[model samples]
Target: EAPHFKPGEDPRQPHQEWKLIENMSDEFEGKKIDEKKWQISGQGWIGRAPGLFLAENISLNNGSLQITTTMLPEPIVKNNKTYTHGGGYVGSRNGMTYGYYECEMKANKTFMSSTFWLINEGKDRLGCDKRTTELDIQESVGQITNDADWMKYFDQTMNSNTHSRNIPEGCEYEKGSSKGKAELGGKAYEDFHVYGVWWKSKDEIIFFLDGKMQSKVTPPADFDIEMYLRMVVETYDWNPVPKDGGMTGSKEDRTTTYNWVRSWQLVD
Candidate 1:
């Protein structure tokens, strides 16, 4: 199994809301970048600003990032093919793997959509026989109302074929089933909330939703690696499980919406 906190012991309860710790805007912008340190689009899918969509709705306004998806006569496509409405993007700040991080924001009340994510962009060397990882907190697909089989968090490694099994044993994931016990509950998206993750170390990781600790993972060696953040706006008639063909509750008979996000870092 991956690293996990002991039963009923979560560190995020005291401070659930995003608080002003330290303004990192200036510290990271001036950092040295020999290459494309942080990318703001799909994984290795290169193109223009809107990338593949005819019109995109992700932007920065009022000192926050806003991702919006509205009803369209047709669909959003990439390379002339159909894709989801909201696209994924990341900030340019390089992240520390063993630090605490969080996002504070609201969801857009348009369609049954969802946005506001804090992610880690790690090197994908496993495919190339390399060792590294990445973290995607606040991951959202369509609304549970649109489709009940929705997942809000996603953490993966570069080499693993399975989204959950890539990590070490003990922390290995058994969706809807934990340690061969009761069914792990599902996460929902209906209002403004906070989602967070802390890579306490490569060996230990914990996830939080609305300030409540949900799941924990303890991976094997080589889990401790440097990474960066990827805040995004996403849309899905499907969520985590359905994306990988696990299981789904209902279909998105209608639309969804996503709003803004806020986040902060734990200071030393």
Candidate 2:
């Protein structure tokens, strides 16, 4: 057997002290959930209600939560028993604030679509939030996986962004490192894994893939307060759109997908 290393020998030393504290919070106004500071409140439609395709395909099956999507045979068909929408996306409760949150889930395929790390509203919020408070930690598309007509697919790269109301006009265009094809090192359709974000206040955020650090960013002055967790999948016709330009669905036929999310609570 190999010898054990000392605590400081590990790079995860800084947060080590904070990791031991369990979920103990008297913060959520008037609400007291001893079980989980934040609980899964069922999945539902996200984004523009009746427009620009959106959905959260997270389904609870077998023993774990599964967020998967399938091309709808038809749009919003009605049999008088239930209402089915064309796409899937889901949001969190209103005013869900920032914290060092992590999610254990897996992705099937993110093609011609988006899996956003978002913060949604109960009503009257256009799936957007206050500037840098929002994140797209892991927005991978399935079109990147197409090999037959792979050249036609959009750039096969992992995409991420940091948005804020306090920064200059072009702040969102800055590109961080990209995990090129195969460099991603894992299959999207594999078993359960963790994708997390350490929302260190508003200006700094760290993203994790399978419990390991993937990216870290320090926002501009506009990096406001903490936002909630909103996971979504949206399908559009276009393969890729300019990140600087506004986010709009495509005219071509496309789809989005998702896995599940379990937001954890850690204290110091």
Candidate 3:
């Protein structure tokens, strides 16, 4: 039998005030992406190693939103640095201060990560001078090997973290901050799984993997600022073989696919 996460009953129930605000699925789309609903992030510093965020790496196939990572033949210089690969990132246009967000997707098992998160861009609308808040729902990372199939790999781990700040420009955050990690029971690269976050209120953020509550955290203070949804595929500076310092030669390309994404709003 193929591997999968059988979602049991959800632990947290939605209140009567909860309402469905957005639902996105490849089965209902006529194009690769809904231009009005999402925006492809432009190339720039990714706060990571190995690659830059390139728009060409994102695409929508028959029923999946595909994000790819590739090893380049030659290094290119940009921002006075050399990059050997390219990655992808996309974000939602509509922002929310508190709500539930979820996505059904298949992950890529390689020296890469497929992540779903929420971020406050430190903009004026959020009443921020130079601080931002980030709520990471899931960050799926895997190991690639020569013996594993191209579309599958051993699922190593899944992680979640939150970074928040409510301070003046150039100051350290004294607000909400926490993180957690979990081991998977099955090969995530081989099957689809549902990953989500329930930002039910300013004080609570609950996380779910395959519909079951995995972990939860309380922010030091209410995160009342607006934040946008985001998905990313990027690589890090990894030493696959500790003794070798790094993997040699050209690396294989890996892809993560998103089947759908949705959000809910609490109506008062």
Candidate 4:
């Protein structure tokens, strides 16, 4: 029997030899997000400056997962960062060593980003536990209205990068070189599209756009850690949320939508 791939999953073909990681694959059909398969909060991060990671901002409805951005009633400073706005971050509960990942997503029409990435929070059972790893499959902003030159092509661009860092107490964030960016034909907020990655091996990653291979990366040799999924709408100081708090109160404008997320691993 052939495998049954969902409509949004059409690009995932040639996966007959791969088994779906059911716990890591979500269709968002339930009345609420499944906590057993996902973690609604707690990524060892609250969010970037001016954007807090508020759990209330995340919801599962209308056959999709929605993460909305909103202004916090009052600014709160924690970990030396001030937050005037809030968004959502949902991290996967189970970690996968290596696999193919894809998601159908529409960006929120704001300066905040709609992202799909993987992380390892340095739960290293040995030594000082100072190393954390990251693999960013996609990081795209919905809008670029602030009149910044760096943002000129952001609306049509998709980005991927790998980060290997020594956390909490080290200056060794040395692997910032694993980055890839591609310009799309249209704005990410205008429609839903498939962004994907094949973490083909410990030393390599392959990026994709709409099932077509776009680019790839040669990750550092130490990129061997179990990574869990994180889909977030976060603010970046570089993108800078508007002084007027852009789309802060408009739900439709502040929300990112995910049709589904899927992951598959090769079978012997």
- Candidate 2: residue 263 lDDT (0-100): 44
lDDT of 3 by residue, 17-65 (tens): 5456663212324556776677776423352546667677778777677
Candidate topping lDDT: 4
Reference-based lDDT, each prediction: 0.38, 0.41, 0.65, 0.80
Q: For every model in order, what is the number of clashing pairs?
A: 29, 19, 0, 0
| Model 2 lDDT on a 0 to 1 scale | 0.41
TM-score of each: 0.51, 0.55, 0.78, 0.87
Candidate 1 achieves a global lDDT of 0.38
Q: How well is each residue in 142-252 modelled by candidate 4, as lDDT tens digits?
A: 767567786688778788888776645543335454888987778888888888888878788888887677787987535666888999988887888676878644687
Candidate 3 to truth, TM: 0.78
Per-residue alpha-carbon lDDT of candidate 2 for residues 115-171, written as tens digits (9 for 90 to 100): 546543323333333223456666555445334464333333334555544223444
How does model 3 fare in lDDT? Answer: 0.65
Could you list the CA RMSD of all candidates, in the order they appear?
10.1, 10.0, 6.0, 3.8
List the lowest-lDDT window of 10 residues for candidate 3.
239-248
Cα lDDT tens digits for candidate 1, 1-268: 1112345644645545233324222122222211254345445533222222212444444344444443344445656655433333445454544555555544433233333323233245334223334455544443333333222232110111102224433543332211101111333333444455665665666666555565675543334555555544444344321342221222222222222222344433
Q: What's the residue-level lDDT of 251 in candidate 4?
A: 80
C-alpha lDDT (0 to 100) for residue 226 of candidate 2: 42
lDDT of 4 at 125: 37
**Pairs of colliding residues, candidate 4:** none
